[PDB]
Design an enzyme around this catalytic site. Structure first.
Site, mmCIF file in Angstrom:
data_model
loop_
_atom_site.group_PDB
_atom_site.id
_atom_site.type_symbol
_atom_site.label_atom_id
_atom_site.label_comp_id
_atom_site.label_asym_id
_atom_site.label_seq_id
_atom_site.Cartn_x
_atom_site.Cartn_y
_atom_site.Cartn_z
ATOM 1 N N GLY A 148 -21.490 26.615 58.553
ATOM 2 C CA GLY A 148 -22.215 27.612 57.337
ATOM 3 C C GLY A 148 -23.691 28.173 57.206
ATOM 4 O O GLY A 148 -24.209 27.328 58.773
ATOM 5 N N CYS A 149 -23.434 28.706 56.706
ATOM 6 C CA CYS A 149 -25.047 29.644 56.367
ATOM 7 C C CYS A 149 -26.425 28.538 55.816
ATOM 8 O O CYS A 149 -26.989 28.872 56.654
ATOM 9 C CB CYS A 149 -24.599 30.851 55.195
ATOM 10 N N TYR A 150 -25.648 27.703 54.988
ATOM 11 C CA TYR A 150 -26.799 26.703 54.724
ATOM 12 C C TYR A 150 -27.409 26.101 55.800
ATOM 13 O O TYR A 150 -27.939 25.069 56.283
ATOM 14 C CB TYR A 150 -26.251 26.069 53.444
ATOM 15 N N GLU B 39 -33.125 32.391 56.450
ATOM 16 C CA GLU B 39 -33.150 33.173 57.520
ATOM 17 C C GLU B 39 -32.640 34.076 56.786
ATOM 18 O O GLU B 39 -32.229 34.441 55.512
ATOM 19 C CB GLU B 39 -31.390 32.091 58.104
#
Ligand code: NA
Ligand code: NA
Ligand code: NA
Ligand code: NA
Ligand code: NA
Ligand code: NA
Ligand code: NA
Ligand code: NA
Lengths: 335, 335, 335, 335
Positions: free
Chosen positions: D154-156, D307
């Site tokens: 996932g992104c986080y 990011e």
């Protein structure tokens, strides 16, 4: 009877919000708005710099060098100025018989090293430090109701202490794990000023003052507990949201934390307690409140506090203290 | 063979975007990045000021006083500087044998009063004015393919002329009604600089340069037609959207306007023509294109043109011209 | 005596601002806040959906099907609803003896084709169209002071007509060149609703309703002059800025335009006229004013008008009309 | 040789960024872009929904029901879809001989309760869970270099683990105090969709998923350490900044933390380590990197990681893994 009110540093962002409230206040009006002796804004109207005030308040900004030009007959002085200026001016206004509400950090903490370490100056008025009321309005007693010098807390310290003080006072936190306060402020908190760091294209999201910000020891001293405090500059003009993560004392429950907050704030009009869920920043911007919600899972607590950084974080708290000092309704002029 | 490339004014916002493209370009590389002689940024890395370049380009910024420190062996000079600096420097670099791509307004228009009125200086190089190619890339011929001095158009003039030139050249507008060009730019168009006007909290939406902006006569001179041009500063960092309202010549139709644009741009890779509807700004930000859509009702035309103000409005057009000048693919390094 | 006030469509963005003002108003209070019969928000508190109202107004949102549940004893009805709903409801509330302030476009223009063309319905109450006062407050006479149905103007038409009406009425424009009104609104003008077009990441800057928007003929009919009107959706929640470009009648001067505006607005408290320069949007957001500045060069005029789209563009004008209708201070509850 | 590449869920925000990179990639091209069987976007061009791709990629979006319409001859499948869809589709594509890069959470963690608790479904492919490579690219070994199913993190979790993993692996943290990860994401992380919560005017700054977000256990399981993880929705479209506060193991120093990070990342091209200071979010948006800086005071560490949530947080990491899987330069198509 109305209070003659002087606003020093009126041309800054917090200063403009003080002008708004004091103008509006039924029991106060403004004698003068001042800028520094060689200010480039001397002679401009307040509403030239802050056009939201056009047709509402249009007092000229007067350059102030000797305070005797502005002290006689003044009941209340708001110092919307940085610490060095406030350190110099506040003693002079007190001597002239004014009640001084300093927005700077100059009189907030009764301690010498505090000033040397975080403010880079030796404090010349130890007696005043002892006399200053710390204007965290919901918690101040009668050192305030009868102080003539009020040090208004910083913007980030205000939300932080409203969230944490009742919990610490009820021994609900395990302080062997320092509370972690992460906060994001709108760019008005940097002040009105042309610098690269608050230039439009230079703002996005970034932490700053990492392990250095002067608000950290103010929060730690007044709470009587070491904390981590990390501020962030966000790409919006107004508001502070603080997300505060703590380890609870063993056995402490959601209902117990809720009881402590309900008891602290139920009759405090400028604190809006969320029974469930956590506040969104837009819901307080332009308002004088501090909004507080929290969640508990296991031995951890997350408490979230928002405010408008220029209102409950600055001008509204200043005026709220004046209301308490002078016996007006606590929210008078604010809502 | 690779072109030695000097970038003067590299530390500004347009300058950073030139560094990015020239670094990336397969046929060019950078000899030096310069700042002014007493610049506070002298000796800092380009990536210190513009961290998007960290790990990509990390050349130091060198202070430049005498250009002979930087001219020998340089094929291409980009002047990402304001007009006074470009007026002084460009003749010197040309004499040293460099091909100069000036981003300033200094050589854009062959006319003396132009400089006195809108730039407040008397232009000292009439011959260069005659020699400069106006680098509006889609329309330049071979004064460009073989110029040694290229004046890159301003950011707002670029979108404006791409929209209007083909229509005027086909006699499709009734110019007795001056075209009205309203445009909104992101704040990077103000340049990297600490001033009150581009300070974060000072930006919302406001027109500026009303009947005074230096881009108005550049657009009018080059189009051969009087126009209204009103720019607005919007609260975002990047992009320009122009909404341009004209009265069509009597009898002119939607299909006729579309034909003129299709014929102008169908084989032009950096112009993206919308068959129906009008572009949204987000769809070009960070890209090198100019996006154009339009609508006609009765005798009125509304044509809408977007670009990234630092890319097609500045750095990408500069590099696009270099590509044309030197015979590389027109879009080389840009996409 | 206080006016019993019903707010229909209270859960929308304009509705929330009506709740705020009417709550605050010393001579009005709220009987109910309604939503549609099958609304998903039925039973939620107004402050659940709009937390800025927490601790201030916490009335539940009641689903309304038959209006007789809500009409008896109601002095004032605000319809913060779209045209179809307002077309159906307003006649019923008038029959029940209520004074109706419709925020929709349903009764704004006395004309049938207007409704068929721009609203896509045949209007069933021609008599009401004749009776409705157009609530452009600065210009309404005594069709308002004694109307029982007030059609509150649209948000964009309000700024547009405040800028243009006094100029047209003094014959200062050459209307052979249609005024060009370009405007940018914050996204609240789209209404509270989940759609792709007002989704966060879908907003940047884009024109919309090009030659189609329903506000164009409202502005043209009421001014008695054809205009170009092009709205743009900008990436901010609140405010409208309009930049309006006209050809002046031959010989018309700056001083002459200024005289006409000074005479129109000097004693109008909600219009703030700029003697020189043009307003910035941030200076009106959250306030009930319309701010107006202008410039003249040669035979062209550029006049710039801002407002908060939900305040002078919607809720504040609605309440301002109620103040006029009922004889209260014009700005009562607004400032 | 080029890899035939299918992109499922191409019309979402992450999907659009996959289209961009895969189009650009010298060794891959696209066979089809799919949407769901009854998608309202079926038959629209990818560039209709994402106009930044106009003139670059204009493949139509094809509705997919039976995967055999799209599997034969496909080398690589990107699933830019939510977990239920990915749970159903990925096994089918693997059986057809495709290498599958799933962006959903469906195969990220080898554990059944994980799916029941945080995803609310019982996972039907235990063998695949065992086989899936977790595509945290800087840390994956040769379960990746030779996996046919890659679960992209996932992104986080991506920024979080890049910051914390090397420190935990070097035993530098006192894990009796759980790391506190506070993160703010841009609204694209919510996905393309019309809902109230990601509607423009509903976004400001607010924590969400408090003690509930599905990324918390993914981060905790993969790091082998309990953490606090609190995400916040911020009012910008793109980027994640994480501020991560830890208690260091007793005696651990700044230089020791720096050594561990320098050794982890010095030869990792998509991780940009800050020697001093902490990154600003704007400096990574639109780029494929994760930027990391940190500070130490006493026994506390603050490490900050940024990011672009759609690039290193989604599409770029997906493509980076494909590069590793297939033996191309790690950054191929990304920079
Ligand atoms: Na007052
Ligand atoms: Na309270
Ligand atoms: Na290069
Ligand atoms: Na083209
Ligand atoms: Na009331
Ligand atoms: Na007025
Ligand atoms: Na490709
Ligand atoms: Na690295």
């Amino acid at each position: 009877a109305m209070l003659n009110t002087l606003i020093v540093g009126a041309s800054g962002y917090a200063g403009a919000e003080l002008v708004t409230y004091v103008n509006r206040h039924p029991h106060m009006n403004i004698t003068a708005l001042t800028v520094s002796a060689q200010s480039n804004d001397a002679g401009k109207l307040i509403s030239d710099l802050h056009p939201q005030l056009k047709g509402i308040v249009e007092l000229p900004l007067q350059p102030m060098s000797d305070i005797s030009e502005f002290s006689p007959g003044v009941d209340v002085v708001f110092l919307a100025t940085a610490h060095e200026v406030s350190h110099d001016l506040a003693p002079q206004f007190l001597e002239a018989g004014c009640v001084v509400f300093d927005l700077s950090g100059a009189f907030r903490v009764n301690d010498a090293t505090f000033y040397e370490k975080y403010y880079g100056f030796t404090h010349q008025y130890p007696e005043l430090l002892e006399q200053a009321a710390y204007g965290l309005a919901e918690w101040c007693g009668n050192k305030l109701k009868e102080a003539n010098l009020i040090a208004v807390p910083g913007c980030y310290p205000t939300a932080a202490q409203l969230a944490l003080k009742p919990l610490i006072d009820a021994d609900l936190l395990d302080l062997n794990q320092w509370p972690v306060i992460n906060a994001t402020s709108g760019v008005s908190g940097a002040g009105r000023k042309a610098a690269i760091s608050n230039s439009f294209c230079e703002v996005s999201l970034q932490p700053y003052g990492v392990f250095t910000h002067r608000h950290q020891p103010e929060i730690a001293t007044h709470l009587g507990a070491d904390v981590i405090f990390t501020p962030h500059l966000g790409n919006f003009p107004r508001g502070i949201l603080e997300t505060i993560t703590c380890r609870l004392k063993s056995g402490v429950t959601q209902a117990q934390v809720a009881q402590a907050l309900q008891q602290a704030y139920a009759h405090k009009p400028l604190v809006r307690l969320y029974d469930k869920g956590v506040p969104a920043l837009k819901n307080v911007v332009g308002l004088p409140f501090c909004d507080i919600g929290f969640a508990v899972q296991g031995e951890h607590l997350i408490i979230v506090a928002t405010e408008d950084n220029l209102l409950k974080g600055a001008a509204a708290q200043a005026v709220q203290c004046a209301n308490i000092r002078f016996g007006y309704a606590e929210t008078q002029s604010l809502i």
